[PDB]
Every structure is written in C-alpha cells, then in structure tokens.
Symmetry: C3
Subunit: 258 residues, 3 copies
C-alpha cells in the first residue's frame, strides 16, 4: 500500500516530505507543507497556507488550516504554523492567522490537542501543552509551555494561559491565568498552584517553596497587583520560576484570574 492513499486528494501545490502518510478520503489543499514522519489519518481536511512540521499525527474528521474571520481585506495573506511531534486528535478545528501583523496561528512542539478541541485564529500554543477534549480558544489566545486545559475549558479572546498552569474541567476563562496557577469553574477562579506538575518537571524544593510563597503574596495577603509585583521582584531575580510567575502577572492585559 502507498504512503499517500490513492483515495486522498493532494493539491499539486502541496509539498510533502517523501515519507509522509495520508489516509483515504483526506484532502491536502493548496499551499499546505507537511514535514518528515508526519502521519495524516483518513477523512482529514488540510487547508493552507499551512506549514506542518515533523513527526506529527493528525486524526480523522479534523479541519486544520481554516479561514481567519478577522481579514482587514480580501486576499490578506494568512498562515498556520505547526511544529514537531504534535498529536491532533479527531474533529479538531484549527484556524489560520494574519501574516502582516505577525498574528499567524502558531503551535510549537510536543503538544496534545484532544478530540474536538478548537484553536481560534491568531492563537499561539507553546510546547508540551495538553488541550483536553472540546477545549476552545476563541482567538488571539496565548498558551505558554506545559499548560494543561482540562476537558471543555473555554478561553475568551486575548487571554494568556501561563506556563505550567492548569484549568479544571468545564472552566470558563475570561482573564489571564498566571504561570503555575490552577483555575476552576464558570467563571474561572484561582485555587492554588500546580505543585504536582512542578515535581514531575524536577523543580527544586526551594523553587517550589518560593512559588508557594509567591502565590500567597498575589492572592492571600490583600495586595494590589502593583504591590504584589514589587514584593515578588526580589524572589523573581533569584528564582527563574518565580520570574516566570511574576512576568505572567506583569504581562496580564485582561487582569489576572482571582
């Protein structure tokens, strides 16, 4: 059997590395580039301009590289960039983003995007993220490394999801989630930090201790964001993980989840 199934539709302008697999009844549209070791399943719709990296897996009934609704004018160049070693499960929908304003939809490496998850236009996903079933990013959402968004997490446009943060199932996020923070409910509320994920990553006892103290400064001692940021300056300069936490609060444009 051929690597590229004869029942698939491959546009002449698509560029696939020699060992790429495409399942039956899949469509690889114009301006779609697929890197080495990528496996496209059956019944997949790929639309471009889209660049897919190496060793990716894209499952049936997914629509990857869908139109950007934002378009300032008809024919504005758009793009979707996907990195390496990602898993895109069944029914996933991923929209492209605008090139001109550096707002392309981009996905990094080692991500797991589970069944029927949705990635809205201009969203940026880092590395080692998990977007569980039916998680939806409205648009212009930034998801930093190692974030875990539990099943049916909804993210309002322009929200930033901090590195190593966690949302509980069915969370509705309207504000920025600082790095490491665990959020739950509709509307989302901050509960704690994902200390479990810190240990799995091999954070030192001292870095975990400073992060636990950092959480209290921000959420449990009646400080304003401005006051909290000044109180964390000292710890952030000493612990890169605390600087990650402080930086996410500093870069919050929609306020932080409380």
């Amino acid at each position: 059997m051929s690597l590229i199934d004869p029942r698939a539709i491959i546009d002449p302008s698509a560029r696939l590395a020699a060992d790429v697999q495409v399942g039956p009844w899949s469509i690889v549209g114009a301006e779609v580039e697929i890197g080495e070791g990528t496996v496209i399943g059956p019944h997949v719709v790929l639309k471009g301009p889209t660049k897919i990296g190496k060793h990716n897996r894209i499952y049936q009934f997914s629509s990857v590289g869908e139109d950007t609704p934002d378009l300032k004018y008809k024919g504005e160049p758009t793009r979707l960039v996907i990195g390496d070693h990602n898993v895109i499960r069944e029914g996933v929908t991923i929209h492209r983003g605008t090139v001109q304003d550096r707002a392309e939809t981009t996905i990094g490496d080692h991500n797991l995007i589970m069944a029927y998850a949705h990635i809205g236009h201009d969203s940026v996903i880092g590395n080692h993220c998990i977007l569980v079933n039916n998680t939806a990013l409205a648009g212009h959402v930034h998801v930093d490394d190692w974030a875990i968004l539990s099943g049916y997490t909804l993210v309002h446009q322009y929200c930033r999801i901090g590195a190593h943060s966690f949302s509980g199932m069915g969370s509705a996020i309207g504000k920025d989630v600082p790095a490491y923070v665990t959020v739950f409910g509709n509307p989302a509320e901050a509960r704690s930090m994902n200390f479990e994920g810190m240990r799995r990553r091999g954070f030192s006892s001292e870095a975990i201790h400073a992060l636990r103290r950092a959480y209290k400064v921000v959420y449990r001692q009646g400080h304003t964001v401005e006051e909290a940021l000044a109180e964390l300056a000292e710890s952030a300069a000493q612990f890169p993980e605390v600087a990650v936490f402080r930086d996410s609060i500093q870069s919050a444009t929609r306020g932080i989840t409380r």
Copy 2:
C-alpha cells in the same frame, strides 16, 4: 471541475438548482431540495425532507436534516427548512421537525451556525443570528433576529431567545431570554442589555435610552412581571424597539432569565 463531484451521492428524488456545488464524498439524501448558488462541502450528510435555499454554504462533517426523536406515530411527516445566505460550519447537527402541528425546524436568512453547533428538532431560528461553536438548542427553541449565542451556550427545550439578545460563553439557559438582554453563567443570569449591538444596528439614542429604562422597570425596581408589563405599555406603544422587548416578556412561557 464538475459542479457535482463524481464521488458525491445524489439521491434520484433530490431536487437541485443547476449551479449547486457538491463536494467529494457528500450525501444528498432522498427528499432533499437545494437552491441556487448553494455550496455543499466535502463529507457532508444531508437528509430530508429538507429544503435548503439559495447561496448557502455547508461545511464538512455536518449532518443536516436528521430525524425528529419524539414522533406521535411512526412515519409522521417531518421537515427542515433552511433559508438563504446561511453559513453552516463543520460538524453542525440540525434535526427536522413535525409538519402536522406546525413545529418544523426552520432557519431563516443570513445566519452563521458555527462548528459543532446543534439545532434540535422543532427549533425556529430567524435572521442574522450567530450560534457560536458548540451552541446547543435542545429542541423547540425559538431564536429571534440578531441573537448572538456565544460558544458552548446550552438552551433548554421550549426556551425563547429574544431578538438582539446575547449569551456569554458557556451559558446554560433554562428560561426565556427577553430581547436585547445579555445573559451569563450556568445557570444563566441577566446582566444588562446589548447596547453595543443596538448602536451597530443604528438605533436612535432615544430608543436606547427607552430600552435602558425598560430593563430597570423589569429587573431593578422590584416589580412583578405583570407590574413591569403594565408600566412598559406606554413606552412600547411609542418605540417599536421597546414593544419588541415588552412582547418577549409577554410571550415568555418558562419565565424570564433573571
């Protein structure tokens, strides 16, 4: 490139306008009628008795015209009627409704039904509505003109969604939503009115002022629904926009969302 893809299945009883486009591996079932300028994507399942009007676009993995789940008797005539200039995104599910008791599923014009949204049996959608991704109408839901249901809004059976109303993302609507009202949460709660939409629609400042006063009469002045409807009578006779609001509270069978 042939308008009807040779890989599509067109039932001999289906009725199509000459320029209808049908993508590969799509099924246009028995008793499906498709109008001028409509584009059916690839991998679409159309089931009848269904009428799809002019200049519609139906995306991949959608199942349009599915069975009504609660017939009085087996073989009871059912129908789905879709108007013109609608966009039905990928994975959308739309069920038919019973003809006899005038409970057909009907969709008007210029609607946008986004990915994996669900339109249950006997639902009635007006014009210029937006049902964002994964919005679900359980059945017998009335959506009036210009309503916007944000992503993952769930609507209980028999609920009425008023004209120009708005639900926040992840809203679980169990009661009627009066016209212009903005609702949020699970269970949904009334917050304000969509004054933004009124301005985009070109409403006069006097109509907006009368609607703002109307919201207070119903929600912020400790009145009963009967008391509110009586106080609104004078304003409603003067502003058609206030009559739209008053009529939506009058026609509420499940009570109004508070």
Copy 3:
C-alpha cells in the same frame, strides 16, 4: 444494493455476521468483530480489538475503538465490548480499555449515546442509558442502568453514576451520583430523586414514597454517610429499589454528590 458498500474498507482480520451493513467510506479496522443486524453508517472509523454486538446502529463521523492512553507497556492487550440494540450517534468517540486487569471499556444493551458524546478508556455503561450530546466520561466511569446524563454533562475519572440517576445539562460531576439522584451545575449538586423515571418504570407508590424518604435521610436530615446507611438498612431490606439507593452510597469511593 450490496450490504457492505464497495467504498468501505473491511480489514481481512475483521469478523462480521453475514447480514452486517457497512456504509460508504467507513473503516472496519483490524480485530473488529460485528454481530448480526448491526448497521454501520457512512464515514465511520472502527478500530479494534473491539466487539460490536447485535442490532446496533453507528452513525457517521464516529470513532469507535480508539486507543487507551492508560498503557503499562507497548502492545498491552486492549478491548472495547459493545452489546446489543445500542444507538451510537454522529461524532461519538469511544476508547478501548485494558484486558489484563478486567478494565476493558464495556457498553451493555439498549443504550443511546448521542452526538459527539465521549466514552473514556475503562468506562463501563450498563443497559438503557442515555448519554445526551457532548456528554464526556473522562475515564474509568461506571454508569449503571437507566441513567440519563443531559447534554454536555462532564464526568471526572473514577466516578460512579447510579441506576436511574439524572444530570442536568452542563453538569460537571466530580463525585459519585447515588442511584435515582438528580444533579445539576458546575460543580454538580444533589437536588432531588428522579421521580419521573420511577413512574416511567412503573414503580409502586410505596417504592416511590420509600425512596423520597431515603433521600431526606441522606441529604436533608443532618446525618453523616455512616449514620444515613444505618437508618436505610430497614427500608432497603423491605424495598429492593431502596437497597439500590443504599448500595450506591455504600460503594461510593469519591464521596457522594451533595
């Protein structure tokens, strides 16, 4: 019209009863077994080792028999077992479970799994259940007979859903649901007993009265779980349906939904 559509793919290792129907562009993967009178629609992905029983109906865009993430080692035997007279609606996702530890994913008889519902690895569904649209069982979830989970009900791993229990739409279940109990919200809260379900099943007036009495003992009389179970002992001995209620609280491992 050929029972196995010539556009479907039947793996040479798949075992089918003679009268099985397979729609166009459907895949009956390796190690899939299908029983008498079963109808596979078009665009279905079946993956094994999976056993599908008799008189089942599987709708388009479903992925049934998907990989279990829970794997002790590569090549560990996995299985999905589906009984008879079930209806699996469009876009439904069902994962296999591990054999070695008696944790296979199993579905009994006469079940209705509605559009885009998700059955996570090692989940066990009994008979006559209804999983409404987009209900998601995270994994290791046990759903007893006649349970109804309303649209978008989310179920945390290891939860038990009792016989004849009910969840409201958009419920986020984190704890066990005792038999007959109705739950609502995110997080889910106990409200009452499913009296309509009791009436539909033709329960005696004495049984419906003893169950209403049982609910109050557990939830509205300030007793602890150990205190409630002791008071229930008498009514449970006389009424088998009260024993069903008592047994579900006794066998709770995540505490009971309150």
